[PDB]
């Protein structure tokens, strides 16, 4: 009946890209989010209630007052940007031991795939450490935000952690 | 008058097809199962109320969250794989041991019975050891989701279980 | 007025051919009993309210579920199968130990008259054990359901223990 | 209306499947007993909780754990296991001489008649020392489990000692 | 109804794994244990709390705060590491004359046996002096934390020392 | 209701072996006797707290601290062992004639008789000078601590000497 | 729930960056520390309460007023500068010497591993003498502050010695 999510990520990841194509339908053009932004979108008679948030250095910083209440998490990674999967994982692993994000359901949106040298989700499965999560239910998607392959099975094994 | 019931088993086993052809009574085209599917059907004037869940090896981990309040489990099983009926065993074995399925009724869909290299239903009731099972009724059904041979002489058992 | 039947018996008897020769009065085509059959049938001003349920090895142990509030047991035998007169004993003795049919009346329709193989109504009272029976009312009918021979003296016995 | 049971023996000998004869009905396929077994059974308007034990050598040691509170003990002995009855004698001279079964009734379940080598009950009584008995009631029956014979014959006789 | 466990061996031995094994029932990627992993698994209604600790040499000297307090322990052995057989002889014949653990029931999971060099339990019950055991109940199981074989039969024997 | 005992003898002979066989029932394996085991052991409704101690030529010199308050001896005495017969018969002579064991019960364990080359419990009685003895009850007994045999002969007959 | 740690050190070792590192996840600008630096940092349900310190000479002296109440001591020391391992010695040799950090647990930040002249936390083991610890716990563990290597897995042995 509701649910509350947190897309976060890296800059040019593809959140508010994401966000906009599962509210809106269409591709929009974008600015860098310096402050956040919200929306509701309903599926499976289901309400999320999105919140994207800036990846910029200094905004990575506010995401804490956005971990409480949070029962889902969208960690979305440029797949293209394959040299920035290191400090990517860093902010997961740091970002799954707080305790306030302790019982919050984790997804991943391996995103950009419609490019040619994208990296596969078992590539990015195995350079996020992700089989190391032990505490926490986790899932990883293949995603193109800009043709919405992919988003609309996320929202769906969301659906899982119900309640 | 009611009853809950959990379909699962291992990816490709045929959960889906068997709920939309006792729920349709057509053989539908078919996607990975990320989230859930939840139908009601009607029989004997009974009202199953089956819950379909995924089988990736992701989602084996959330079927926790289904235990709860069921009251007949369908462990479907391909028999045409049987590379993979060691697996479907592990699987059994450990949701046998879950206190939240004491009382829950077993049965068996041993689907994929009109392909050529099928396995009998006694070859597999011997190979996931069934016979072993002492806590709670049992049974097995050899099964075609695509022709409905076999599913409504499930819903049948399933009665016995009643109230 | 009133009263409540149980038809129980090996796989290959007779339950429901008859219970559906008391009800209809035509012999039917049958399928292996997997779930259960109950239907009302009236006789004498009273309406016996009777359940045949499945005699194969894994529906041999569900028919607890019915000895609750069970006022008559129907146990049919195969008189030509004389290779398991031993099992039915084997059933019968240890249905006649359970607590919830202490007063049951007991009827035993030997079935299968018709046959030239079969055998005496007597050497079935022999080979069941039935003179053994203390704390009970018994009695054994010769039947032959396709005909309706030995079927409306049964409810005719039953109808002594009334009430 | 109650009362307390502890089958024990040495490995191999019947008493799993003796327990679940008398509390389904049916042999089941066995495991080795590591920890234990507790099933209640029904008869003659007593519950009779029965605790199966693993016979193992290293299981031998926790019986103790066991003894306190135990009204009756059922000693199971394979009949065919003619090399192994010297075992046997002692596991149940040293657990005559426990303190805690100080009241406790014998019984003795010879079991495994079925087969063609088996040895008689007189010639186990005879093995076994049981008329050394003197500070203790005991009893001993030829049993089946697989067939059901003698099984309940003898907790006829564990009723002699209620209360 | 509860029960507290401390999973201890050498660094490499399995402990980790056997319990994310146990309780997510999927076999995790791992890290070296430099703290401590605590995690609740029910079985037979019983909720065993098992503590998982390190086997680094340095963390050896920190397993006394947990002795405390303890019912069962749970010493993992690598099989296929047969050059360090006897520093675990060592480990385990320190910590069994601590008098803490005065009471603690004894299992030893000797795994890896998946290996092809790995040693029966047999020749670990020899090497690790077992039989020398005489103030404490104790067990040997083999196990394959990777498949889970051996694991449900060793909380099934630490039922047997319960309360 | 109680009873202190004090198991002494050469090295070699079997105190160790006959205390845990009467404690826990099986044959463990041993290693010398430095210090002192201590045990209690319940039959016949008396509680016999039996001290093993060490056997080698520099603990038969620490045996003093043990004569107080002790009520009865077993003296254990190798059969097979024909060529230290002489030594064990100066300790036993010597043992005698201390004042603190001047009530003590004296029995005499000839032990490893399963052996070709045993010699009998007359030969030493003959050997070991116990008709010689006239302030003081004494009794010899052959044994088989391996096996059990006239080990719970022992303590029946130490019984004797109660209060 | 809670536990008081004391972060010292020699200057320019990395005491503010791993505290910063640790609090809010990124790398700052340092000034010397002059006074002191107090934050709490949660972790394994655990809240550490961190008081870094200055190492410049005129502040060494002042260390002791905080030895007081003090549960856990982070000794981070400079891998780089290969030049001041001895007057890190001498400093830690005295504080381990102090009655009021008598209990308190032992951590060794060896900290700039990224620096190629880097040595290895063996060697520091071996020049600052820790293996002559004995009536403390300790730990040495190899960091990178400007990446957060090996800081959480310090915080992790320190939980270890939790109340
Ligand atoms: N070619 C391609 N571009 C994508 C895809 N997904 C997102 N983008 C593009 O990449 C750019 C960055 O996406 P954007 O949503 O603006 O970043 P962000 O996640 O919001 O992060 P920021 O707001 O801090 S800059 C955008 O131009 C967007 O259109 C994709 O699948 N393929
Ligand atoms: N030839 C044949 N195909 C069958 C039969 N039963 C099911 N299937 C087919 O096998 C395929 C897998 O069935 P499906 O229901 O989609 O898997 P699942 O049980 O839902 O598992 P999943 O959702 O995690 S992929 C489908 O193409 C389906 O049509 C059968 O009896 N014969
Ligand atoms: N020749 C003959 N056939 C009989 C007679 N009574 C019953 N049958 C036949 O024997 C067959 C078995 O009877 P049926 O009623 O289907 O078994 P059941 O008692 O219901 O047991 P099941 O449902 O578990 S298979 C049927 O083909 C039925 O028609 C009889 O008197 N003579
Ligand atoms: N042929 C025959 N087999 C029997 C009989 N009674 C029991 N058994 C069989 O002998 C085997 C051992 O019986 P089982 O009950 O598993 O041993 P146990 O008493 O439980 O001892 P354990 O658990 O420590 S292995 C089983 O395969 C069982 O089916 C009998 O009367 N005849
Ligand atoms: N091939 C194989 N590997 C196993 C088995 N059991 C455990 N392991 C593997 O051996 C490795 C060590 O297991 P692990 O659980 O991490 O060590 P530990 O007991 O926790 O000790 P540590 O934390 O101090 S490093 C792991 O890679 C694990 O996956 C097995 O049965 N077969
Ligand atoms: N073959 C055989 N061996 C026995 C018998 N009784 C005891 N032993 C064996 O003889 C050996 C010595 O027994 P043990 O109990 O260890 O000596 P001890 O009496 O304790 O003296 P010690 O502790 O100073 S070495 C052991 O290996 C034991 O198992 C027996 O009846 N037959
Ligand atoms: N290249 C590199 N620099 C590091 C590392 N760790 C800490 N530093 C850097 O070394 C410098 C000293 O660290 P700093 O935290 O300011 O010293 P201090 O421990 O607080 O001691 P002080 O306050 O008395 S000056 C800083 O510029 C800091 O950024 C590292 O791992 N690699
Ligand atoms: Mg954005
Ligand atoms: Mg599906
Ligand atoms: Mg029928
Ligand atoms: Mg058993
Ligand atoms: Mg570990
Ligand atoms: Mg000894
Ligand atoms: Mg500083």
Redesign the interface.
Same mark, same amino acid.
């Given at each position: 009946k509701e649910m509350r999510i947190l897309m976060v990520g890296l800059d040019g990841a593809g959140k508010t890209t994401v966000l906009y194509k599962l509210k809106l339908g269409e591709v929009i053009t974008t600015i860098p989010t310096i402050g956040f932004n919200v929306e509701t979108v309903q599926y499976?008679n289901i309400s999320f209630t999105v919140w994207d948030v800036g990846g910029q =250095?200094r905004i990575?910083?506010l995401w804490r007052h956005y971990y409480r209440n949070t029962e889902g998490v969208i960690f979305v990674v440029d797949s293209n940007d394959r040299s920035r999967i290191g400090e990517a994982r /860093?902010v997961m692993q $740091?970002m799954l %031991? /707080? =305790?306030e994000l302790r019982n919050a359901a984790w997804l991943v949106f391996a995103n950009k795939q419609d490019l040619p040298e994208a990296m596969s989700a078992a590539e990015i499965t195995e350079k996020l450490?992700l089989?190391?999560? $032990?505490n926490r239910? *986790?899932?990883?998607?293949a995603t193109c935000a800009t043709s919405g392959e992919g988003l609309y /099975?996320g929202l /769906? *094994?969301l659906? %899982?952690?119900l309640k």
């Amino acid at each position: 009946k509701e649910m509350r999510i947190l897309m976060v990520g890296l800059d040019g990841a593809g959140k508010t890209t994401v966000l906009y194509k599962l509210k809106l339908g269409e591709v929009i053009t974008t600015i860098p989010t310096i402050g956040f932004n919200v929306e509701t979108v309903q599926y499976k008679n289901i309400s999320f209630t999105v919140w994207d948030v800036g990846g910029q =250095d200094r905004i990575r910083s506010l995401w804490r007052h956005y971990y409480r209440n949070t029962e889902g998490v969208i960690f979305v990674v440029d797949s293209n940007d394959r040299s920035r999967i290191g400090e990517a994982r /860093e902010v997961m692993q $740091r970002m799954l %031991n /707080e =305790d306030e994000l302790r019982n919050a359901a984790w997804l991943v949106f391996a995103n950009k795939q419609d490019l040619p040298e994208a990296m596969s989700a078992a590539e990015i499965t195995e350079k996020l450490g992700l089989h190391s999560i $032990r505490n926490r239910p *986790w899932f990883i998607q293949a995603t193109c935000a800009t043709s919405g392959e992919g988003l609309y /099975e996320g929202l /769906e *094994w969301l659906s %899982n952690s119900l309640k």
